[PDB]
Design a protein around this ligand. Sequence first.
Ligand SMILES: Cc1cc2nc3c(=O)[nH]c(=O)nc-3n(C[C@H](O)[C@H](O)[C@H](O)COP(=O)(O)OP(=O)(O)OC[C@H]3O[C@@H](n4cnc5c(N)ncnc54)[C@H](O)[C@@H]3O)c2cc1C
Ligand SMILES: Cc1cc2nc3c(=O)[nH]c(=O)nc-3n(C[C@H](O)[C@H](O)[C@H](O)COP(=O)(O)OP(=O)(O)OC[C@H]3O[C@@H](n4cnc5c(N)ncnc54)[C@H](O)[C@@H]3O)c2cc1C
Lengths: 440, 439
Amino acid sequence: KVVIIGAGFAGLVAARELQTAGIEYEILEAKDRIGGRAWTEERMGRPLELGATWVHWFQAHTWTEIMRYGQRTEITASPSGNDAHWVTDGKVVKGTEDDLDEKLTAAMGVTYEGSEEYFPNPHDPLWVLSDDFDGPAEVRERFLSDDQTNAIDLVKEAGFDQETIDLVDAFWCAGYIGDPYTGSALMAKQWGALSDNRYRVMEDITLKWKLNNGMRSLYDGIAGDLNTDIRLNTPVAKVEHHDNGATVTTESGEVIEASAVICTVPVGALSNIEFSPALPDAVQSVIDDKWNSQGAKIWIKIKGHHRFLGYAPKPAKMSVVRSEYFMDDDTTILVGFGYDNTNIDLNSIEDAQAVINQWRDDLEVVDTTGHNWVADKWAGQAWGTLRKGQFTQGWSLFDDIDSQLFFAGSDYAYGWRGVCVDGALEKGMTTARQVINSMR
Amino acid sequence: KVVIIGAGFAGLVAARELQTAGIEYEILEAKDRIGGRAWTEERMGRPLELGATWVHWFQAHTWTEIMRYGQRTEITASPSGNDAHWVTDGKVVKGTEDDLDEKLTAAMGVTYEGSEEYFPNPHDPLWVLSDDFDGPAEVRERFLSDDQTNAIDLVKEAGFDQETIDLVDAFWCAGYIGDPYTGSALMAKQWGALSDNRYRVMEDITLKWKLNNGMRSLYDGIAGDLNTDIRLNTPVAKVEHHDNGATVTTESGEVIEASAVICTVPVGALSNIEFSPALPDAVQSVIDDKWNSQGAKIWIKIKGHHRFLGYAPKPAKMSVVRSEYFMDDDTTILVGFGYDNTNIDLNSIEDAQAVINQWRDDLEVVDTTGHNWVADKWAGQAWGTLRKGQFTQGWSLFDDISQLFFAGSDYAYGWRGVCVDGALEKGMTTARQVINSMR
Ligand SMILES: Cc1cc2nc3c(=O)[nH]c(=O)nc-3n(C[C@H](O)[C@H](O)[C@H](O)COP(=O)(O)OP(=O)(O)OC[C@H]3O[C@@H](n4cnc5c(N)ncnc54)[C@H](O)[C@@H]3O)c2cc1C
Ligand SMILES: Cc1cc2nc3c(=O)[nH]c(=O)nc-3n(C[C@H](O)[C@H](O)[C@H](O)COP(=O)(O)OP(=O)(O)OC[C@H]3O[C@@H](n4cnc5c(N)ncnc54)[C@H](O)[C@@H]3O)c2cc1C
């Protein structure tokens, strides 16, 4: 009776929540697999995360699932103390990872600047615009202006030298997983607020601890709890939505009447669904302009054991590349993040070699792999990141649909929105509660 | 079919988890109310937390419940910028809350000292004693030795002055909710590890954010999800757990058959239940020596609006007292924590006045209240804290029992005893143990 579109983390956790409340449901998933933009798969000789990878105990929703499904001690920190290399003036500069981190920490000071005023409760991101806001009006002015400024310009305007500008350029090419110059600096400020306003904590939360048994240990755990079979290979083509319910039509033409629809399809793939009535103009505007996520994630295998970290600014094929696994056959697997999925073939050895050649001529790529989420019609984006103006007139607009259609997914979370599974687990669960409370 | 003893946070969340898995259960609760050691109740003109109070988004289990039950924006920070007072060599020193926080930050630096080596994953507290431990043998030796050292001695040995010693004494009288000199320093080191090894984070997590609608908004939310009525006024007197299945006998003599029993009764009340077979000897030794929680929590109402913070070392009636509410009739409600429940009558105006008189003879108590959990036969303790040796030979001995599983904040891996987070953690994971067994 409640139809959930998508068996990613948001749809799976929503289904479990409805099950707890005794509400009948059905999950319809387009692919022949569950997990969505979390996808653990054997490649290049071991399980690799083609999407979601890192977790932390300061992510409440993710951590509770880690505990629930037996993974409490099954996390491992990524390699640290790497030899670092960074782009600078079209030239490669060498240093320690600590040197690089010190420069990034200095720049984050200015990047986070108004977060203490904007986000006393970092899980109430739009408090500044609410009726409860009791601060100075200049705080609200600066909040709105920061939605229209990118994170690099904050560092430029503070007087940092070109080396730091190029370092933060590379950093935010990875963090916005897209062109950082089109992004909203408020996203970075909220990451600060959720990270105790410390660069080291932000990196601990988003870029340190990996699941030994993969994200699949969590998503298969949730699916294994469900008493209703997930309908795979069942893309939704149309959603009619009204005050008392909804009608879902599949690609095969099957019509399913529903008491509510929980739609977890990401913005990059919402164009595959016809909505009747059409979604509000303000929401359609976000869908047309989408979100800040045009980049890509690669895994590269090189000969030898090398503790490597590289940064390079836009328009590099990859902007952040780091050693992740030292393999038993004297190879290293590195992960990379880049701003433009169309400038790199994740499965081309020559392109992976070009990435490595950004910093070191003498390293030799023997394998490479990745999944181009942006070119995947059921995703159309990597993790959701915000363009200018989307912090205040973007993700939150998906909550005001005056009908039994509800949007859930990491890209609409209050907390670790888009970038983390924590946001999907948060928003799937709380949207199921919206449905539960309505029915009660 | 699964019998859950106790309707505190652990038993409630375990019931919900079993319900999700389609497993029949029943909760038997001794009292006429749910919530256990979380208890939001109208007193002195407003809802006051007679047990659990503070929350944070870095507490995964608590925070997920806050999100689930609609309380995301319904948190408020306790008053700050108070005028601070501390007792040192029998004298009262005045200062700013900042001065006091700076002294405590300096002391926590040495208090947390080995936490980076012991607790890389702060949710695996016994990693050092495991077969996966791969550090130097001196790290294991230091870990074991630290279980036998109290947290104040670390500060004394580091050479801090008497003023800082008296401050940390007061602080740990509250934190150990009991005599800190009998406590295990590993507890404090794990708090550090769970708080990014920074005093300010540890205080933000445990002593800052209150629920506007009380802990009751969470425990009543969980109870409202349950499709099976909770049996109130139904104390369990006996638990049989031979390998057949299990049997529970109530005080009234009713016998209930069970596939498994999840017992959330805290150590301080476990002597009310007869277990057959007897619990393991090491568990019995913990029950006899109990846990580090003989203290008490008071709410004092004084005349006027006063931003007050006071610290005093053992054997003060209260060791940490802080303004919490400025009331509409020109009064202030303060909260206090003290190390010895038998040295204070939480409902005596004269005793509350003696507390205030530790620091300022000119403030006037007009009301006071509290619940002495230690003298409550269904608790017998405040929040669970560790005596020397109980970090490595205490809380973890209650796992793997007989088929009776123990769940409760006092056995959690993370924010054990001190936080609702630990009850929600361990109630949920113990239900998962039962689920997995049945699957
Ligand atoms: C490259 C990358 C790396 C990441 N790394 C991390 C990380 O290290 N840590 C972290 O915490 N998070 C990470 N994330 C983020 C995390 O993957 C997401 O936040 C989360 O997985 C999103 O879950 P969701 O359920 O909201 O959406 P999705 O996972 O996108 O689920 C939506 C589901 O709907 C399905 N679907 C789409 N259209 C239809 C249709 N018409 N009909 C039916 N079904 C449909 C899709 O196939 C999919 O299964 C990463 C994301 C990416 C892209
Ligand atoms: C003074 C105080 C202040 C606190 N402040 C905070 C705070 O600020 N923040 C925080 O996060 N945590 C705080 N806590 C801790 C928190 O209250 C506990 O960690 C948590 O509530 C314990 O839950 P539990 O379910 O494990 O145990 P309990 O709450 O003790 O639940 C056990 C239940 O079993 C029942 N019972 C006992 N014996 C029997 C029997 N024989 N038969 C049947 N039922 C029985 C009891 O009545 C009770 O309902 C505080 C605790 C105290 C004492």
